[PDB]
């Protein structure tokens, strides 16, 4: 599951509804920790 | 992330000689539609 | 609100403390104290007609650089209190000012 | 050229309307966008708000729109009002004109651009404080 926003906010230009900034979680080498981490997404690969 | 200035990805082309391309072609086209018939591009359908 | 000082006769450097981030676009202003606010420079190179030939800004060019002011030949008067009105891309439309950099020039 | 004279109260007393008027001389309002500057003791500057020729009153959000801009083609004049005022605002105020320059960095058909207000043309500024003595 993502939790996720949207990145560079209050832009008046044409690119708004694209660049969406999500975080998740994913497992290390040790299975026992977890690890969090902030990425970056396209509008056309994630659904609400 | 991203360093620098949002911008949108785009593709140039040339005007004229695109025009002049697309005259070419309506030429080689009209030797199996008579003379004077009326020939109009339009835009894609629909699909994925 | 921030000091600095400078003895008389050399050049002074003074940026602002803003974090610029995009293509920059700023302007410098000077408020002496019970006096009106004038201008200095705007769009990072250009002068409006009265100023001398003693100011000059930084040319936005090669992203990756620090705004900053630097003045010669520094006088008495040269005290008054400076800003850093600044504007970008991605930030969006500013209100404030920022910070007023007290130039207190000894000698 | 353009010159620029206040006209206010000086002493209101708190919870009432404060109105001061700067008057425009020397040329008209045709093309100048009109702002308003705030500078109180024990802090730095503040700008306030703008108007231009589509009579666009546009606020800054940190100040609760209890301000009214009020603008004069008729007699050359601008105005403002300031309603359920605080005794915390004992301020000289400036009534300075601004232009309006563009940049465009990128491609003009993308709307790529943003725009910018330079103050170059200022005011010598009147002091009105509010007072509930
Ligand atoms: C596909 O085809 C499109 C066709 O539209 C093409 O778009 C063009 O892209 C370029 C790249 O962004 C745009 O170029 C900009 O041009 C403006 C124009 O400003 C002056 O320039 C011309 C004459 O040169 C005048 O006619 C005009 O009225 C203006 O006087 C520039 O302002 C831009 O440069 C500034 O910003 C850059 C980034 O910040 C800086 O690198 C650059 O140096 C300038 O910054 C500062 O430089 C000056 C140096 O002294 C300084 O004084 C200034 O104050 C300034 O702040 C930028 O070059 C161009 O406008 C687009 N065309 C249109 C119609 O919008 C695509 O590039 C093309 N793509 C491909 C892949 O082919
Ligand atoms: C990472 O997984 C954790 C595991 O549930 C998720 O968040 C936790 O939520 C509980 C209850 O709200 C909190 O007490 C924990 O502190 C949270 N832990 C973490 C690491 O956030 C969380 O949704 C996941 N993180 C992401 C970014 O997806
Ligand atoms: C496209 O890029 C080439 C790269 O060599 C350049 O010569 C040309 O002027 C550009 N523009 C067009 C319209 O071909
Ligand atoms: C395209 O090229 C023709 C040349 O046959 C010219 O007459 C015309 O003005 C050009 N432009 C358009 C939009 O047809
Ligand atoms: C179309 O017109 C050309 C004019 O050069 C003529 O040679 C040709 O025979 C015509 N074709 C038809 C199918 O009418």
């Known amino acids: 599951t993502l939790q996720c926003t949207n990145y560079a906010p209050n832009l008046l230009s044409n690119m708004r509804g694209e660049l969406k900034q999500c975080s998740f979680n994913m497992t290390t080498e040790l299975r026992d920790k977890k690890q969090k981490v902030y990425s970056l997404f396209y509008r056309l690969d994630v659904v609400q | 992330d991203i360093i620098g200035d949002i911008r949108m990805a785009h593709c140039n082309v040339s005007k004229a000689t695109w025009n002049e391309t697309l005259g070419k072609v309506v030429k080689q086209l009209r030797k199996h539609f008579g003379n004077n018939t009326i020939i109009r591009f339009a835009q894609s359908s629909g699909g994925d | 609100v921030r000091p600095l000082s400078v003895a008389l006769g050399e050049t002074a450097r003074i940026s602002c403390g803003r974090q610029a981030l995009g293509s920059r676009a700023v302007q410098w202003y000077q408020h002496r104290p019970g006096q009106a606010p004038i201008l200095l420079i705007y769009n990072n190179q250009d002068r409006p007609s009265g100023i001398p030939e003693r100011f000059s800004g930084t040319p936005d060019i090669n992203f990756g650089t620090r705004a900053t002011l630097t003045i010669s030949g520094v006088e008495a008067g040269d005290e008054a209190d400076y800003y850093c009105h600044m504007w970008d891309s991605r930030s969006g439309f500013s209100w404030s000012f920022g910070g007023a950099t007290r130039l207190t020039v000894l000698g | 050229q353009v010159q620029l004279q206040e006209s206010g109260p000086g002493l209101v007393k708190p919870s009432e309307t404060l109105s001061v008027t700067c008057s425009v001389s020397?040329?008209?309002?045709?093309?100048?966008?009109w702002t308003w500057i705030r500078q109180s003791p024990g802090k730095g500057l503040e700008w306030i708000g703008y108007?231009?020729?589509?009579?666009?009153?546009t606020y800054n959000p940190s100040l609760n729109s209890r301000v009214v801009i009020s603008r004069d083609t008729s007699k050359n004049q601008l105005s403002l009002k300031l309603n359920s005022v605080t005794p915390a605002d004992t301020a000289v105020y400036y009534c300075?004109?601004?232009?309006?320059?563009?940049?465009?960095?990128?491609?003009?058909?993308?709307?790529?651009?943003?725009?910018?207000?330079?103050?170059?043309?200022w005011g010598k500024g009147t002091t009105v404080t509010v007072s509930s003595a």
């Open positions: 020397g040329d008209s309002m045709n093309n100048y966008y």
């Open positions: 108007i231009s020729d589509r009579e666009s009153a």
């Open positions: 300075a004109t601004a232009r309006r320059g563009q940049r465009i960095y990128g491609v003009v058909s993308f709307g790529e651009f943003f725009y910018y207000y330079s103050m170059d043309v």
